[PDB]
Amino acid sequence: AHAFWSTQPVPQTEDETEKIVFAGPMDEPKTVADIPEEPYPIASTFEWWTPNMEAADDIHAIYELLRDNYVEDDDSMFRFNYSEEFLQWALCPPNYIPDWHVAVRRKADKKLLAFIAGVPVTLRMGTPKYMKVKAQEKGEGEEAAKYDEPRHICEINFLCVHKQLREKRLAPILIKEATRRVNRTNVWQAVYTAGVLLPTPYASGQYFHRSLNPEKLVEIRFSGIPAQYQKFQNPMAMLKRNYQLPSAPKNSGLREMKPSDVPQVRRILMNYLDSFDVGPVFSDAEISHYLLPRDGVVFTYVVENDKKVTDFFSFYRIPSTVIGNSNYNLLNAAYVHYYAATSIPLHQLILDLLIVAHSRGFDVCNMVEILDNRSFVEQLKFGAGDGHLRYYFYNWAYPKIKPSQVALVML
Numbered sequence: 001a002h003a004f005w006s007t008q009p010v011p012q013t014e015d016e017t018e019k020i021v022f023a024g025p026m027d028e029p030k031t032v033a034d035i036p037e038e039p040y041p042i043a044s045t046f047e048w049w050t051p052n053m054e055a056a057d058d059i060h061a062i063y064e065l066l067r068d069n070y071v072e073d074d075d076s077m078f079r080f081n082y083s084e085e086f087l088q089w090a091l092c093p094p095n096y097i098p099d100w101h102v103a104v105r106r107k108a109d110k111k112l113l114a115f116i117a118g119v120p121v122t123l124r125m126g127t128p129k130y131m132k133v134k135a136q137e138k139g140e141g142e143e144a145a146k147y148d149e150p151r152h153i154c155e156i157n158f159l160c161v162h163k164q165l166r167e168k169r170l171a172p173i174l175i176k177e178a179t180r181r182v183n184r185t186n187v188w189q190a191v192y193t194a195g196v197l198l199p200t201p202y203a204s205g206q207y208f209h210r211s212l213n214p215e216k217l218v219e220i221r222f223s224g225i226p227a228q229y230q231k232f233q234n235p236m237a238m239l240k241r242n243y244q245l246p247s248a249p250k251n252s253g254l255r256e257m258k259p260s261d262v263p264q265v266r267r268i269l270m271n272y273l274d275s276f277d278v279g280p281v282f283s284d285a286e287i288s289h290y291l292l293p294r295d296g297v298v299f300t301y302v303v304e305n306d307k308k309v310t311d312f313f314s315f316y317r318i319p320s321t322v323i324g325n326s327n328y329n330l331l332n333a334a335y336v337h338y339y340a341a342t343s344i345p346l347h348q349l350i351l352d353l354l355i356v357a358h359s360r361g362f363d364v365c366n367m368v369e370i371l372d373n374r375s376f377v378e379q380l381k382f383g384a385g386d387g388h389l390r391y392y393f394y395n396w397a398y399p400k401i402k403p404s405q406v407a408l409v410m411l
């Protein structure tokens with residue numbers, strides 16, 4: 001059934017994942033010395049390429065590959081169109097490893113044919129709370145706590161093979177070469193998400209959306225007027241009214257984050273994330289990188305009253321190409337990123353996120369039911385989508401957990 005994933009150090013079945021009690025590695029300990037120094041073999045017509053992410057032109061080539069060949073919805077109505085500014089942000093965080101960005105080009109014309117990216121992350125990935133309890137009950141605490149320390153691992157994203165090169169087993173070769181490059185830096189685990197079901201997720205959550213521009217969403221068939229709107233004389237008018245938001249934020253004290261906020265944001269975020277079983281640990285430089293506002297990419301607001309930052313939220317933009325329609329050629333989506341509330345209810349904080357996103361011309365707000373995202377779904381009129389995001393580790397045995405115990409946002 002899985003000619004590639006059966007050869008890899010991942011859980012092979014759902015059962016296996018449901019049996020796992022303690023976090024830890026799957027494969028045998030290896031050193032950097034054990035790992036081949038030479039790139040994985042590839043067909044003579046292709047070549048490995050390491051793009052320079054601080055080269056506008058290299059970013060551009062990656063951008064076009066993804067624009068034309070990255071994830072679509074199941075109806076081929078929308079294809080993500082991550083911007084070049086977004087890709088530089090995502091691909092080049094503090095202390096990134098240039099060699100973890102792996103491309104394949106056709107040797108002749110040097111056409112970019114495939115890509116995968118890895119970036120560093122520091123992740124808490126030790127045994128979940130409810131397994132450390134079963135463990136104490138069992139007299140098995142030391143084993144349960146062995147890998148409690150945050151680990152410096154790899155987060156994989158943006159795997160993409162050109163449409164003309166599909167179903168030729170190129171994706172496995174990319175994954176093998178990325179693994180080699182990561183392993184050669186003495187990193188042995190990776191975390192990745194996908195919409196598809198592979199062997200084998202440790203958590204899975206539904207997608208949710210909140211309409212901001214229902215008129216447009218209906219036009220492009222992102223949305224359809226649901227059946228109960230038919231018993232109305234003007235269904236569209238009732239839909240627009242349903243999703244209407246204030247023109248201006250409601251929280252006094254709300255403003256954009258600035259560099260001086262970085263310590264307080266790091267502290268309140270770390271306190272909040274601490275509480276989930278799987279979650280990132282950020283340095284000040286990483287808080288700066290992932291949360292300070294960047295035009296068209298990431299938008300972050302703090303609640304400061306009394307010279308004190310008590311709350312914040314962030315969202316990032318990913319537009320999609322609208323493949324079919326031609327009144328509109330882009331869907332402009334805002335995604336809930338990190339947040340922390342200490343002074344106001346989370347629904348009141350995130351309402352301001354929707355107000356701001358709508359004000360700035362976003363069409364829809366998306367999120368997965370990670371973090372405490374479920375706590376504001378109904379009041380803020382989110383609906384579940386058809387999709388799920390599945391979370392996976394490479395080379396890491398981990399108990400199945402609920403998505404509300406996951407605190408890692410993946411771009």
Ligand SMILES: CCCCCCCCCCCCCC(=O)SCCNC(=O)CCNC(=O)[C@H](O)C(C)(C)COP(=O)(O)OP(=O)(O)OC[C@H]1O[C@@H](n2cnc3c(N)ncnc32)[C@H](O)[C@@H]1OP(=O)(O)O
Nearest residue numbers: 002003004005158159160161166167168169170171182188
């Ligand atoms: C320690 C360091 C480790 C670092 C590595 C950690 C692992 C990282 C793992 C990657 C995490 C990526 C996270 C994201 O970026 S998820 C986003 C993935 N990208 C897209 O969906 C973009 C559009 N689709 C494509 O570009 C291609 O269809 C891809 C590249 C997805 C497959 O290309 P193609 O369609 O031409 O197929 P093939 O003949 O070459 O290959 C067939 C094999 O590929 C397995 N497959 C299919 N889809 C995925 C998928 N999304 N993750 C992992 N494996 C996948 C499939 O089960 C089969 O294996 P097996 O069933 O036969 O066994």
Ligand SMILES: CN1CCC(N(C)c2nc(N3C=CC[C@H]3CC#N)c3sccc3n2)CC1
Nearest residue numbers: 071193194195196207366385387388410411
């Ligand atoms: C690897 N990733 C591709 C883009 C995905 N992203 C950004 C997304 N995905 C959505 N998917 C709905 C079905 C599965 C999944 C696609 C995949 N893969 C949805 S649904 C609404 C927003 C949204 N965003 C986030 C990480």
Ligand SMILES: [Mg+2]
Nearest residue numbers: 167168169170
């Ligand atoms: Mg292929």
